[PDB]
Design a protein around this ligand. Structure first.
Ligand SMILES: Nc1ncnc2c1ncn2[C@@H]1O[C@H](COP(=O)(O)OP(=O)(O)OP(=O)(O)O)[C@@H](O)[C@H]1O
Ligand SMILES: Nc1ncnc2c1ncn2[C@@H]1O[C@H](COP(=O)(O)OP(=O)(O)OP(=O)(O)O)[C@@H](O)[C@H]1O
Ligand SMILES: N[C@@H](CC(=O)O)C(=O)O
Ligand SMILES: [Mg+2]
Ligand SMILES: [Mg+2]
Ligand SMILES: [Mg+2]
Ligand SMILES: [Mg+2]
Ligand SMILES: [Mg+2]
Ligand SMILES: [Mg+2]
Lengths: 294, 289
């Protein structure tokens, strides 16, 4: 769209919903003793987002800072681990991400700029995090019924499926979402080096919304051991050079076991207001493959 | 500081205070009916920060985008969309020189940025005073220490600061209460009427310096483009914004941005802003992490 067209849309309802969602979610975490961090947008290191069945293997945008190449944040996952290393115990951030995805990813769920509420908990296990997310989501959906006067899935806990089993039964998480009428978990997905893997099993989880809305949250237990981390990076064809300061911290033995997740704020707003395309809930759309005018 | 030294610092108390500050400030705006917007980091347009350095840039699908200097122009566009009252916790990227490493500058930071349709300068100042007074009282509970009391702050004209103290920084070092500086000639978006600028900076005492800037805004296309031309800026670096102004869609408003890290610094009483950041971003020193 062009500038004047963009500012001509009526998105007041979506923004009012977003405000209520942000109020609810931030209070959820501060009420439970989480510390609230500010984001970083530029770093020598960022989330590789690869390997990942959910991706095409994009490289992060980058810019020079005092002559040094910095990467724009793909996600703050490595920084969350470092925050745990600093003894903050339980942390969250409203983190903007920049992911220059292709036109193939303009499916109504993707934006090339977006924010996730990203959180991490020292010593947590996958079951603990999934239980916390269920509590947050159940509580939010009850609130959403008051806000909108419409009904939302009533489930207090969600069914759990192995990634491999999803592939076999539905073919893809896409079709699975299409068939379900309640949120559900997909677990054990081989992906990035930082998700914990133990004897062929991945200790990770994606929360999928029903009715074709697709993934809304993703997380895992983490790796913390240097030699294990380096082997995974190498096996994936990635370069140790891209993670140098982080691997220095790992080699020193300063990473601690932890688990966490990120929740897409815009994807959640979209679900609650029932928008067909995520661009409808953004004052300034960032459609994959289409450079925005404003 | 290498990577290991950076993460070996003690920062728990500062983050603890920051959490309480963020909880207080976001609740302050939601309580008063403000909409909570999410930030943008890449756009063809951004705050020039001049008259008062060039924006970092990156190509996005073949188009040159600017990293956010500030969301000022986007705030005005949200007013134009009819959102009425808005705020955002907005990260900024400002690649300042090594000279700006003065203890209150970082090349990445967040401001709580807000805007209100139809508001006048004294409306926004009163609102900021209410916020700060309330925060200072809560901080006495959190920290067991005493903070500035003033319910309302002294107002200095910009010229009177220059003549009596030389700069806002020297003024800061000699006050014990927050104070306002008004009528400062700067960027094209602040409203200027009869040689008077309808704008304001909130300055902290004890040498901590500026914590907020804001103003009523220009909304008329002709008035806007004159100030841009006069300043020596390129109209074509603001095209889609000027399209909207020319279309007659900009509305009168006022607002301000408040430096979150600068506030945390004041309340914990840290000598350098880097002490309250988990990952320091010191001007002229590319971060190691
Ligand atoms: N391009 C995007 N646009 C909007 N929201 C997103 C986008 N990418 C991720 N998110 C949201 O934030 C979370 C990000 O974590 P993560 O990087 O692991 O997601 P993802 O694997 O890349 O998602 P997807 O495969 O659907 O593109 C997601 O669960 C989702 O809710
Ligand atoms: N480099 C920075 N580091 C940390 N906080 C900043 C920085 N620049 C601005 N801020 C904070 O956010 C606000 C941003 O608005 P503004 O553009 O008007 O600041 P500024 O005029 O450029 O600040 P200053 O004169 O100290 O350099 C400031 O009032 C301040 O609190
Ligand atoms: N946030 C300021 C602008 C800035 O200082 O970046 C304002 O609202 O005027
Ligand atoms: Mg995914
Ligand atoms: Mg993806
Ligand atoms: Mg994911
Ligand atoms: Mg400045
Ligand atoms: Mg200033
Ligand atoms: Mg200023």
């Amino acid at each position: 769209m062009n500038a004047v067209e963009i500012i001509s849309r009526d998105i007041y309802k979506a923004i009012d919903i977003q405000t209520k969602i942000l109020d609810y979610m931030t209070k959820f975490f501060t009420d439970r003793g989480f510390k609230w961090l500010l984001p970083i947008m530029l770093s020598p290191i960022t989330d590789p987002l690869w390997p990942d069945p959910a991706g095409e293997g994009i490289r992060p945008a980058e810019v020079d800072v005092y002559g040094v190449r910095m990467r724009l944040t793909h996600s703050m996952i490595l920084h969350k681990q470092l925050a745990i290393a600093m003894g903050l115990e339980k942390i969250f951030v409203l983190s903007p991400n920049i992911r220059l995805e292709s036109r193939r990813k303009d499916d109504g769920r993707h934006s090339y700029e977006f924010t996730q509420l990203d959180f991490e908990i020292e010593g947590a296990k996958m079951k603990d995090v999934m239980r916390l997310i269920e509590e947050l989501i159940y509580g939010l959906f009850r609130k959403a019924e008051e806000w909108t006067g419409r009904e939302f899935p009533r489930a207090r806990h969600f069914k759990v499926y192995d990634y491999k089993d999803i592939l076999e039964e539905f073919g893809s998480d896409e079709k699975a979402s299409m068939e379900m009428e309640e949120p559900f978990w997909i677990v054990n997905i081989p992906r990035e080096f930082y998700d914990r893997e133990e004897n062929g099993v991945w200790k990770n989880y994606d929360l999928i919304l029903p009715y074709g809305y697709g993934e809304v949250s993703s997380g895992g237990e983490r790796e913390w051991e240097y030699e294990k981390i380096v082997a995974k990076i190498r096996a994936a064809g990635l370069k140790e050079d891209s993670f140098r300061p982080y691997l220095e911290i790992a080699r020193a033995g300063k990473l601690k076991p932890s688990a966490g997740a990120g929740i897409g704020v815009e994807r959640l707003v979209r679900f609650i207001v029932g928008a067909k395309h995520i661009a409808e809930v953004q004052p300034f759309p960032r459609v994959p493959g289409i450079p925005a005018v404003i």
